[PDB]
Write a structure and sequence with these properties.
The structure is cut from a larger assembly and holds 2 copies of chain A, 1 copy of chain C, 1 copy of chain D and 1 copy of chain E.
Chain A: E1 8-10, E2 15-16, E3 19-24, E4 40-47, H1 60-67, E5 71-79, E6 86-96, E7 102-105, H2 108-124, H3 128-139, E8 154-161, E9 166-173, H4 186-200, E10 204-214, E11 220-221, E12 250-251, H5 253-260, E13 262-264, E14 276-277, E15 283-284, E16 289-290, H6 300-308, H7 316-328, E17 330-332
Antiparallel strand pairs in A: 1-7, 1-17, 2-6, 3-6, 3-12, 4-5, 5-11, 6-10, 8-9, 8-10, 13-14, 15-16
Chain C: H1 3-25, H2 32-37, H3 43-53, E1 57-59, E2 87-88, E3 100-102, H4 109-114, H5 123-128, H6 142-153, E4 173-175, E5 179-181, E6 184-185, H7 189-204, H8 206-216, E7 225-226, E8 232-233, H9 247-250, E9 258-260, H10 279-282, H11 288-301, H12 308-333, H13 350-356, H14 360-363, H15 369-375, H16 379-390, H17 396-400, H18 403-423
Antiparallel strand pairs in C: 1-3, 4-5
Helix pairs in contact in C: 11-12, 12-18, 16-18
Chain D: E1 6-19, E2 26-28, H1 32-47, E3 52-59, E4 63-66, E5 68-69, E6 77-79, E7 100-113, H2 115-118, H3 121-132, E8 142-143, E9 155-158, H4 164-177, E10 183-186, H5 188-201, H6 207-213, E11 218-220, E12 224-225, E13 233-241, E14 263-274, E15 288-290, E16 298-301
Antiparallel strand pairs in D: 1-7, 1-8, 1-9, 3-7, 4-7, 5-6, 10-14, 11-12, 13-14, 13-16, 15-16
Helix pairs in contact in D: 1-3, 5-6
Classes of the chains: A alpha+beta, C mainly alpha, D alpha+beta, E alpha+beta.
Chain lengths: ~325, ~325, ~425, ~300, ~80
Amino acid sequence: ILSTASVLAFERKLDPSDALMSAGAWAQRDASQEWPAVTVREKSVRGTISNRLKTKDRDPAKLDASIQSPNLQTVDVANLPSDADTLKVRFTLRVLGGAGTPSACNDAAYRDKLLQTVATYVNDQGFAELARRYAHNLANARFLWRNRVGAEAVEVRINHIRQGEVARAWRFDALAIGLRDFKADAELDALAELIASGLSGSGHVLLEVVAFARIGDGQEVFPSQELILDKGDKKGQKSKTLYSVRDAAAIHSQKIGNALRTIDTWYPDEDGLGPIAVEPYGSVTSQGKAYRQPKQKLDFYTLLDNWVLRDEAPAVEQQHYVIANLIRGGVFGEA
Amino acid sequence: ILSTASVLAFERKLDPSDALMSAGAWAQRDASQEWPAVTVREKSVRGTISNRLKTKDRDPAKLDASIQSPNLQTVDVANLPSDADTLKVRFTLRVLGGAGTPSACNDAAYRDKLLQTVATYVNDQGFAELARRYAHNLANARFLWRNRVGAEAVEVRINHIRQGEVARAWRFDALAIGLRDFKADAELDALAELIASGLSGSGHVLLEVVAFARIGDGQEVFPSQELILDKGDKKGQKSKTLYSVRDAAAIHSQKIGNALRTIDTWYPDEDGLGPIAVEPYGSVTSQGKAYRQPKQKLDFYTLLDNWVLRDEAPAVEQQHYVIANLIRGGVFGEA
Amino acid sequence: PTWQELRQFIESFIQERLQGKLDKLQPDEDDKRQTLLATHRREAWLADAARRVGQLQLVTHTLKPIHPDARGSNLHSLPQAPGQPGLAGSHELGDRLVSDVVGNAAALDVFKFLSLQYQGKNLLNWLTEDSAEALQALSDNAEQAREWRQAFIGITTVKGAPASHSLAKQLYFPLPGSGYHLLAPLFPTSLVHHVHALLREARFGDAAKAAREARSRQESWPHGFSEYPNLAIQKFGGTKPQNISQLNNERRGENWLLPSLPPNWQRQNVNAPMRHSSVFEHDFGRTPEVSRLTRTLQRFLAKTVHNNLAIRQRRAQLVAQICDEALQYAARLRELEPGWSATPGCQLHDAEQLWLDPLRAQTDETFLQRRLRGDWPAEVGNRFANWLNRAVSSDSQILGSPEAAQWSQELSKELTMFKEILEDERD
Amino acid sequence: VTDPEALLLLPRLSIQNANAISSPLTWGFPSPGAFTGFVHALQRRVGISLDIELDGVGIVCHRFEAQISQPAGKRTKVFNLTRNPLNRDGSTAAIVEEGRAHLEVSLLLGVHGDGLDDHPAQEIARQVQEQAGAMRLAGGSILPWCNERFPAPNAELLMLGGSDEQRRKNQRRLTRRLLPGFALVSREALLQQHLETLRTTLPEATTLDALLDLCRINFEPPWQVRDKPGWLVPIPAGYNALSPLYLPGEVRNARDRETPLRFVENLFGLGEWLSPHRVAALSDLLWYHHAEPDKGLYRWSTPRFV
Amino acid sequence: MNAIHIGPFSITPAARGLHYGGLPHHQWTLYYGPREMAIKTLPDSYTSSEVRDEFSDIIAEFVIDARHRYAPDVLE
């Protein structure tokens, strides 16, 4: 009957490291191994109430009384030095093999059928499109996020590390490569071939990704913010806390992974957003809305179940979406 | 019915940096790249009883007993050198563009309607008056908050940084350009047009703003100030702490941004006070009162809701105020 | 002993429950009070209790702390006490055991009704055995008593087939000969409740805080206290702890984890002793760990010799800890720049700079590599011994007696071991 | 349970986000069960192909860093979390708190078999290194040291030296390699000795109270502090049986249907962090599995230490 | 709230408050007669017991320093 597995899990393929942030001057990007790190500092901010009022605080006397109480906060801030205009973001990326193999799965017939489905996908077209989109997300500085917004020029340098040295080196102009269009380029095709060979291999392929963004002299950079629950403590806390590994501002690994996963342009809604991160039930945290709802037949679980159990193979784009979810991983399976 | 979005976050356009302040000599300000930074020092003050008594301890015996025991405390103090008469304050400003687009918006229809409203604003009246007023606030040293009140002569030099080089340079006498009137000047109109091109998204604008002010030999300068929660005796009764980055006195970036935002001359009260910073509910911290009360129909939220949801376009001045609020950014939206 | 008095107690308790729900609801209309008094005063309320018991369960190891969308089998089990030594667990929990409740958060009234102590002890053991005092106070008929007894006793048994959800943890353990077992662990809510009670007594108890106030005034007290540093809070329910369990509702999350941390978990920085003359007293001397070690050595230098063998042993591993920390401190200076020792300066400790920077020999092939190879500097041990002599209490009573002889002998042993460590640094 | 013929020093491994939630009652460094399972996975993946056996692990913890913060006005600590993806209805999911930490460790793997003589030591050491370079140690990825100043090579040393002096020199040089760290060992005998001492101090004292007393900071009135012999962390000592051993197909929602499943619960024991110079041989730090499936007691420990 | 008196000490709050984080706060200053000893910014949700516990350590170290400074001289 080929019942679906009660416990299903997939290992996270294509896992990056923390994006270390460092600062320097442009046209010295080559000798950037000794660039000083960007440090997270402390500063005091005094604001004023600017949020919406609930029709009972709109009395002028209460508003003036609440303004007369100073609103003080302590925030973590990260800045470029007052003589450095370039932010260097460096992280390491492992492209693991055994991409379609589940990490944990109950039913052995479901094992054979799922591995047969992945084998059909890989010998039909393989990871050609998926690794193309991942290499595009590497080539443009999507992992900088807000650091990519107002940069004069962004250059991404990607090096293949085989044993301890650069086997093959890439250099891209991130602002020329779009954040929503996946064209074809020769160096991009070479990077896609390397990533696809890593996904189809039995070991791993190591890449280091170094992006230089010309933010501005002494401007304010944006490391990943840390999620800390207040938990109803009586003392006032610092409102903003930035992430750092060793006295050096950094971006979270899952933030970089979410940036790399932004390849899904096949969701049923219109591509006004463009690509979105590959997730089950197509959730977008910034938009607060989950595309690929299960009421439509385009969510990951129903597509996978139709593909592997009832042999209802979806469209090629939906097959790419399902295999991209397999790259992403996750804990699956009903009770 | 097109209700407004619950999440309507906006990012900050016109990003400033922390303004580092240095010292030197007038008529030596052309070669001022090697000027030593103003250092934050510690000095001892002895305060007397000079505040209002609470009508209970106004008897002569208790007042004399309090005067016989004054309080000792340490304050952070920043001064020019005794052989240096001018203060150099230097920061970089970045104009982003894309003001109407929210960073986070959970309602797609509201986002489309808001984008249409901002687009028809730009088509009708582009970022010409707003950029003009920002150019005024850059031309006069309003970012010199207390360093400008008694200065003999203030000069502001603004350089447009293209590819790391000065594409265009400006020079203003900041005391001739007052803090009260938004007049017309050819060089200042060129600066306004550059800021307009930055705000419209038609080009990358990064400005380096340097201000020179003659205060006097050894005179006290006023950097930004930090908040102190605990005084104690382990610290030597530290009562005031000044802001510094690396042993160099500095002004907070949000104070500079507040000084740039002082363009709002359209509030319902009389403009005898002059321009105020662009904030929701038009609040001034020093005045302790809110111009543009929500009871009147001239605060940012009601104007934005009428403009977008009910298509009630306000006056052109109020449209300028709303778009200046959008440029300022915020956590707009209800719960 | 008598069923009449147990009936009196249960009728009394449902009477306070009735008046409490009437006072809290304050029903002035809608005929709520009549329905409350017609359903919560007779054997019909026992029928509702038997209905509500089937939705609840008493457990000792629950699964709901693991991802709350996981639907698995919660267990009420006490593991057997192992014969192996030096390990803790749930098998220490004997009479000091508190039973968790899992299920609906509104049916917990039957739990406090079932955990009553009417005549001296719990109702559970009364309903397990064929007691004449029990099994008749709740039912006039025998069949009703039997069905209510089975209902109220099955609450401690496993309900349904044994199942651990996908979101629950399952960990392979290799058997000694060619095998594995799956080992799905459950969260020991009884253990964390017991440790939470102990830690709450130690950190907020009346005697504990009295001892803290006694120490704050630096006066004597008949007993001391504990400190419990570096505790961590792991909450299970973000806003609804009662959706997990009643014990997790008593302590709203707050796992109160203990700090199993390595000594290098607070690595501050590495700094070069540039313009100073002897690192052991000037830069090595004020690291907090060695400061604590030398203060303990200061306290143990002037001590009684009633337990002199154990005291000398403790001081032996003490000075061993100082020498180990010295070796660690040199090892972490080994990650600095290779040529920091060649910087200009009037006082830079050139005698100890051979040991402080081994890596200078790489850049200086003929300037200092052969000198370090041939000299093999072991006078650094002598200088550190002189620093330790400066760091020991200047007691003439020990110097006159053989206590200084034993201290010098153990110091000589530790310093010759330390010198043998520094001997083969050229390999 | 056996004497290794050689010691395999996996070099400094940078572990990114390791599970800082070691046990239901302890936090901080990951459990030794994670390291023993990682070594067993190394044996299952590459150890069989090399005709060797990888049993025993030495944990040194060259660097530790947990993603924790201390809220203002509290002396305890909280764990920094991650923003999980939204639900299918666009709302924030319920937060499940997990602790994630940064490690830097080097592992001493006990090697015994015929592949040591069948293959060169450098070759098997290398192949184990690039096998471990694509794995996980405590739930976190392993950073493989690309484009730094110089990577640390893997080094396998046979314990059967040509002489006692040669063996002693090799042991000391291997100890010098992993010097900025602290070896992790187990102290079950010390915990039992302290429990007996506590019982003579006052009766009916459980080993949980002895474990708590050996880790807490004790203050005694004349105000001194009861000193500790070492670091003395509390560590999970294994798993104890909580249910009868079920058949592979009995348990619903199991990991597989080929392995028996038994519900367990954590066993908490005593551990110690100590400098590697204070051990006679580096093979005394190796952690081994001790299952004994008849009575439960699925334990990991480091025997032959003292 | 209201001033807290602990023997010769007094913890008087500031007349006007402030907001640190998103919570209201007042500065509480400790006196020993006319001598100001320490100032702490404390949440408005604290009771008098918590405000007193915030300054208990400073009071205790004052007591210790007073005992050691004015200890009577010893004859042997």
